Design a protein around this nucleic acid. Structure first.
Lengths: 286, 148, 287
DNA sequence: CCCCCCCGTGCGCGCTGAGGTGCGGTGTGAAATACA
DNA sequence: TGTATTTCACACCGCACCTCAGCGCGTTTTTTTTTTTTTT
């Protein structure tokens, strides 16, 4: 009475971004009430295969869509998705509480985002409980990056989380982490392609994405990292950002970063002046 | 005036590798009207070729444009489907003015609407990235590469 | 007819050189606007299997196309793929900055590329921060060769990349790396066949492709590496390099390499045999 | 007022059932041959 | 003029051909696993 048509089902799945298989199966079996194709799916004799194929097709679409967005467009697409209301005033006042002019952090972001070699790593240095991890992890969370973990450097499998994401955080890099950077990732901070390795697989040769590293060691004062002086821009977080009297006055929700970017699209030297017809074509990928 | 000459036909062939006669049919009377026209223009400036695309779009249901120049010279080609039927006299006056060229620089005849090689000409042209396009393909070309 | 035809899809995917599945699926769904086979594919309820087959066939075609080219054809293709603005002056100036003639480097490069045994490893020895890795990384980027890493030598699969690429780079070889080359991998520096694994595969025995190493250690001065003095050609880098405002006073492009190889197609003595078909229709019989 | 190039080919093994078309196993006589 | 003796002639009824595509359709150990050498 009503033949099944996998195309409209994958179009519906991509409509709601239901990537995982179980959510597909459950939501579509629910939607069978008012979607003839879904009743055809319910009466179909090979349901699990269709769910699996739909999951695979949606994953292909979404992953390829993410990989094809140029950096200003991706920043626009991460600005759209951040939810909340706040202000950049939190960033400005946090910095001015650390006695660091914002213009310094701008003139570092301008380079760090462009991937310019030898200026493609921003280190935040200060005694702990001073607000380093707050800003660094809030900013990495905004950029949709992946938080790395210096602990597993016994294995060479801890760089595998850089095959996809476009921003990495290395948290509390102690002397061992600094030595590891100086010895094996001399290339990465120089922007040129590196050779990462994953578990039970083969190595891939990709460009090293930008980075944010938090450390208690002033590398630009040490001497064994004489090479590291030319590819790390240090930031002195000295003052106590956390509770002055019991409650942390400062926190950066996604709205703060979003409004920061929207108001500072010019000074970062990017472009989001598309405004093509109404918003965008965005027709279909059935 | 100025339909065409052995020299204009020769240059067209050297650039597009086929005769202008194999993609058109003949209208001997300059007053006979028709919606579809094939136009060849010699010695045309790039800025006017590009401007004509935007201007013709507003009075056409379909338009396909391309150009090819070499040692000999430059010569573009247009398949135009006007919303309203026009005579060669009218199209001649419209395009000489629009393109900033003498009438002698043009060649105009309606399309050959029956013949596979003729339809393939437009079909193959639509596969080049450089070709400018507007509207839905004419049925005689579409049905010229279908038929199961 | 609207029936989907897989050969057309394979021809199209090979046409733009899309190999990975995700790009094939996304780009093809995008192309579905003006491709009857595409608008047929969208409706074929076995989309995933077709995508997997298309990616596998494109991978097969491309891999068996690269391995079928002798070396001068490979360098010709890499030169065809390189674009930019530059010259060989932007290289010979660097060499004169380090105070080495270029003619000696050419007399070495010819042999190195030919893979001649006992002369198939260039070692660039220089103190830290003198520009070694800059030149080596530029050159290996142009030759489209992979770069190894002595980090994983505890896990013996770090040689897996040696099974495909035609110019291996090992940067910053320590004492342990040189001892490893002296003891285990002497055959590769000679040029005799070696066995190499590939994750979930079998040890494919192949001739060892040419290498390129940078190490602070002077192998031709030590006495433990007496048995490497006859398998390594060295070039000394002494004069200083990048310490100035994040801009190394010398950066080697791909246009530099292109004009280098093209301008010296006679001195490196690269050529092909009796030729009567070079600039013709590429054999695209994969449809 | 007539010829200086578009053009690189065919499909899940296997079924299997309604569909109808025809020269015949069999449908089996009024016409038709010759008898007396 | 009555009557034995027979294929063509429209066809009961068909044996059996070819004609489509909706039904079936798939691999996963080995390495990595932290285990105790592997200089010290």
């Amino acid at each position: 009475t009503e033949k099944f048509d996998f195309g409209t089902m994958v179009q519906w799945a991509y409509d709601h971004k239901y990537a995982e298989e179980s959510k597909i199966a459950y939501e579509y079996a629910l939607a069978a009430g008012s979607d003839s194709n879904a009743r055809a799916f319910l009466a179909t004799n090979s349901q699990a295969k269709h769910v699996k194929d739909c999951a695979t097709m949606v994953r292909h679409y979404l992953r390829a869509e993410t990989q094809a967005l140029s950096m200003p467009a991706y920043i626009k697409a991460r600005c759209k998705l951040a939810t909340g209301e706040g202000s950049w005033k939190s960033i400005l006042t946090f910095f001015n509480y650390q006695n660091i002019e914002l213009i310094t952090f701008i003139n570092a972001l301008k380079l760090w985002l462009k991937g310019i070699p030898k200026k493609n790593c921003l280190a935040f240095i200060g005694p702990p409980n001073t607000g380093k991890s707050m800003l660094c992890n809030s900013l990495i969370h905004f950029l949709g990056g992946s938080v790395l973990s210096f602990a597993n450097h016994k294995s060479h499998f801890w760089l595998a989380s850089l095959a996809d994401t476009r921003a990495a955080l290395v948290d509390d890099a102690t002397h061992a982490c600094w030595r590891y950077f100086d010895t094996y990732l001399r290339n990465a901070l120089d922007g040129y392609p590196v050779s990462i390795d994953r578990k039970h697989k083969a190595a891939v040769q990709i460009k090293a994405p930008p980075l944010l590293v938090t450390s208690n060691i002033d590398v630009q004062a040490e001497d064994r990292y004489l090479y590291l002086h030319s590819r790390v821009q240090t930031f002195r977080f000295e003052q106590p950002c956390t509770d002055e009297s019991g409650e942390q006055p400062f926190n950066i929700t996604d709205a703060d970063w979003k409004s920061f970017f929207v108001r500072l699209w010019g000074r970062l030297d990017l472009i989001d002046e598309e405004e093509d017809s109404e918003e965008d074509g965005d027709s279909m990928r059935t | 005036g100025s339909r065409a000459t052995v020299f204009k036909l020769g240059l067209f062939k050297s650039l597009f590798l086929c005769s202008f006669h194999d993609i058109t049919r003949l209208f001997k009377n300059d007053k006979t009207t028709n919606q579809q026209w094939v136009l060849a223009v010699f010695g045309l400036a790039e800025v006017f070729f590009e401007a004509s695309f935007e201007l013709l779009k507003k009075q056409c249901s379909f338009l396909q444009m391309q150009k090819r120049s070499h040692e000999g010279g430059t010569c573009a080609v247009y398949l135009i489907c006007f919303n309203t039927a026009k005579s060669r006299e009218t199209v001649r006056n419209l395009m000489a003015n629009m393109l900033n060229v003498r009438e002698e620089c043009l060649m105009l005849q309606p399309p050959k609407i029956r013949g596979l090689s003729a339809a393939l000409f437009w079909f193959k042209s639509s596969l080049s990235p450089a070709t400018l396009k507007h509207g839905a393909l004419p049925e005689w070309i579409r049905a010229q590469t279908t038929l199961n």
